[PDB]
Design a protein around this ligand. Structure first.
Ligand code: HEM
Ligand code: HEM
Ligand SMILES: CNCc1cccc(-c2cc(C)cc(N)n2)c1
Ligand SMILES: CNCc1cccc(-c2cc(C)cc(N)n2)c1
Ligand SMILES: C[C@H](O)[C@H](O)[C@H]1CNc2nc(N)[nH]c(=O)c2N1
Ligand SMILES: C[C@H](O)[C@H](O)[C@H]1CNc2nc(N)[nH]c(=O)c2N1
Ligand SMILES: [Zn+2]
Lengths: 418, 414
């Protein structure tokens, strides 16, 4: 038993789910790594094609969990499934998931994502099975359909598209983009950066692959898609599938003249989805934005669009010294405008007040039915106004449950070109 | 072994070797992280005390470039003699100063540690009565306050002996405001202090029953019942809160005290436990403007400020709370600066902490830091500490939590 307390409400929750955790957190009895971005390299199967004694135990554990979930365990179909997975590994060194197991696995990987404040939605996830894909052209078709379904004319819907699992490690499917939709970044001759500085390296790869850059501040990047280990290929997402929101402010009429915009669909495409020892290296997933992601991090991080100085000037703030809080003051106005703009255009978005409140309710739900909820305080607390949200005052336990979403190397560090 | 921490804004990478010197638990295990748990959870024997004392004396003599010296070996022998004959020992004044400074240096939740080596240590180990403690604390407040040019200080009372004769300051800080629950369920003053205010009233304090009554000192010497004392009002420096642009702000009637002075923690040096050790620095603005004023369970002023600001309070997505929070914190900094009372804003403070952290990795091999506490409670990611990976571990000497004394004290009168 482990208790967590909320210091605002004095609610105490009791955690037993942590007894099912599989991987190391990175912490020990003597050192806490809770603010390390990648604290652990502990993996459930070695790098390349596992032996039978390595894969089968992980498969059995997942199948046991799935059949437990549906009030079976030991049933006819469970034992036959075990035997089927046994023969499949014996004869191919891997196995294939049933459609139901795949959906269960994807939803539970989201459910287990301790860094995600959005998980009250976890069981309402649309799963697109793309395991029949064979070429980068087919990957583009599956991704276009995902983007169109998920955008839904602004009434955003959570979705995941799952490409063929890893086999030997030389035939990986990868989306090289970090998100399906991001803006290019360009190193300028004088030394500054145009567009998104985070994407300068990826933009250079695209240009080096023949992309013709319009060289603006908000150029939607092409897709760079890799199927079955082959060299990646460039595709332009049809712009009518890319919903964008011009940013304006409900009081500052000059705000629109800053020429800011963002895209509506946050779609992570560089993570790995691990189910029963199987590794799905291409599994783009998408939901909808919390405003602080755009307003605080994308726009105001020093190494991103870094717009605080420009907004503060227009606001006529005292920028001589930090103690005028001119940065904090512009920061609020920017986040007001982001929310106001998405809402004006009827594009789904949630503010950090509503999102964090939903997550406290999700925590309570999970402790009641599941006996726990893994949660990473460092990621869950929003990057502005921390303590006036309820999650700031909520103790959380962090542990690693499977199925899960994991980080993986960027493909340009590992891909041997042809 | 080595551990690396990266800053994701600057890509600077630092290498921690100092974590190898910890030997106290964090509360985390290899499969669970408890990094957001507030408190992750009676006197040492001779055998327990020997190695704790040795480790501390060894690190003192190493710090002063005399490890292995004749003075080092004789001090070790002398300490062992005391433990053997008295079951405890006494620190030299130099060791006490060194221990107190390093407890601060090791405080993983404190963002102000760039200042750690400039700490004025008042030795109060000869004190025997609550009247004596009051005198020592008055002198601490006056020295630390310094007419608004604040100076860090700590006053250290006699160490624990058998656990039945503890010195304790029952206040959680030296200066705080009273809280009174009303019959209708409202609270007047600071709701955090309702319980301690009740104890004071029960002990004979006559409260003014206003919004900002400075509480009396409740002081316990040698395990006796605690005794009430009024800090002389001319030693309690306060700042009335006004705003540089909203002339109505002063009409909220807000004020705060200038000296933050924690008095309920325990200072452990070489196995010795100093249960009464009040220490003081100066404020970071968000402590007052964000937590004291805008926590829902504290003075909770967001509503009244936003109303006078004429904000739309119907929807959360108007971010009226966020907008009013910023203005309150502007007022707090402007007020202190105008009255020439030392204060630091969260931007300046976090920037200095990054510089201190880098220096500590260079000269010491690391810097234990609690990201959950170091990142300020507003505007988190526009400060540099948000982007800084940190390792948290427990080094000694250290400041430790201890039970509230009213939960363990057994009373003697009537
Ligand atoms: C439905 C609305 C959703 C909201 C509002 C939401 C909110 C968030 C936010 C604010 C973050 C932090 C992002 C960052 O700082 O980079 C995050 C992270 C994450 N989300 Fe969610 N999310 C949603 C849906 C989803 C879905 C559908 C999935 C997967 C099926 C998912 C899986 C994750 C994962 C794995 C992370 C961690 C990313 C990392 O470690 O880099 N989320 N989410
Ligand atoms: C000199 C200026 C100082 C500044 C600006 C400063 C800043 C801070 C802040 C903002 C906190 C967090 C407070 C909270 O959120 O409750 C803190 C905590 C702390 N400070 Fe410092 N501090 C200073 C001096 C000191 C000194 C002189 C000591 C001891 C000698 C000290 C030891 C601590 C400890 C032990 C904590 C953790 C308290 C807890 O866990 O409740 N600090 N400091
Ligand atoms: C490496 N950062 C991960 C990352 C970066 C950018 C956006 C997200 C995100 C993802 C989803 C599904 C919903 C949401 N509101 N935001 C996640
Ligand atoms: C329960 N938190 C402890 C606490 C509560 C209130 C204030 C502080 C503090 C202490 C010092 C020395 C400097 C500073 N700026 N603030 C610490
Ligand atoms: C060092 C620190 O862990 C890092 O900056 C983290 C802090 N918390 C975060 N929280 C979220 N949601 N997203 C992030 O990218 C980060 N970055
Ligand atoms: C639950 C959580 O650990 C708790 O609210 C912490 C968060 N970080 C904090 N950080 C500081 N400086 N002070 C605090 O009181 C807290 N409270
Ligand atoms: Zn930890």
């Amino acid at each position: 038993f482990l208790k967590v307390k909320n210091w605002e409400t004095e609610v105490v929750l009791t955690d037993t789910l942590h007894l099912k955790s599989t991987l190391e957190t990175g912490c020990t009895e003597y050192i806490c790594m809770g603010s390390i971005m990648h604290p652990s390299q502990h993996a459930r199967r070695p790098e390349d094609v596992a032996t039978k004694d390595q894969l089968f135990p992980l498969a059995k554990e997942f199948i046991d969990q799935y059949y437990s979930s549906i009030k079976r365990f030991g049933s006819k179909a469970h034992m036959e499934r075990l035997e089927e997975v046994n023969k499949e590994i014996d004869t191919t060194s891997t196995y294939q998931l049933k459609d139901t197991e795949l959906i269960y696995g994807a939803k539970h990987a989201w459910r287990n994502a301790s860094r995600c404040v959005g998980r009250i939605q976890w069981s309402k996830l649309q799963v697109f099975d793309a395991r029949d894909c064979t070429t980068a052209h087919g990957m583009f078709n599956y991704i276009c359909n995902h983007v169109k379904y998920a955008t839904n004319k602004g009434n955003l819907r959570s979705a995941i598209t799952i490409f063929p699992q890893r086999t030997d490690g030389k035939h990986d499917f990868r989306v090289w983009n970090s998100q399906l939709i991001r803006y290019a970044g360009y190193k300028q001759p004088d030394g500054s950066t145009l567009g998104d500085p985070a994407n300068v390296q990826f933009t250079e790869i695209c240009i080096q692959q023949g992309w013709k850059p319009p060289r603006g501040r908000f150029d939607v990047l092409p897709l760079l898609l890799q199927a079955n280990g082959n060299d990646p290929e460039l595709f332009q997402i049809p712009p009518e599938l890319v919903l964008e929101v011009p940013i304006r402010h409900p009081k500052f009429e000059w705000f629109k003249d800053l020429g800011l915009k963002w895209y509506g669909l946050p779609a992570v495409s560089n993570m790995l989805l691990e189910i029963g020892g199987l590794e799905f290296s291409a599994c783009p997933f998408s939901g909808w934005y919390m405003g602080t992601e755009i307003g605080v991090r994308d726009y105001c991080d020093n190494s991103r669009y870094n717009i605080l100085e420009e907004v503060a000037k227009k606001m006529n703030l005292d920028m001589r010294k930090t103690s005028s809080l001119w940065k904090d003051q512009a920061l609020v106005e920017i986040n007001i405008a982001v929310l106001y703009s998405f809402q004006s255009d009827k594009v789904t978005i949630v503010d950090h007040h509503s999102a964090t409140e939903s997550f406290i309710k999700h925590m309570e739900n999970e402790y009641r039915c599941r006996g726990g909820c893994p949660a990473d305080w460092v990621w869950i607390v929003p990057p502005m106004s921390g303590s006036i949200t309820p999650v700031f005052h909520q103790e959380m336990l962090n542990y690693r449950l499977t199925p899960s979403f994991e980080y993986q190397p960027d493909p340009w560090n590992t891909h041997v070109w042809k």
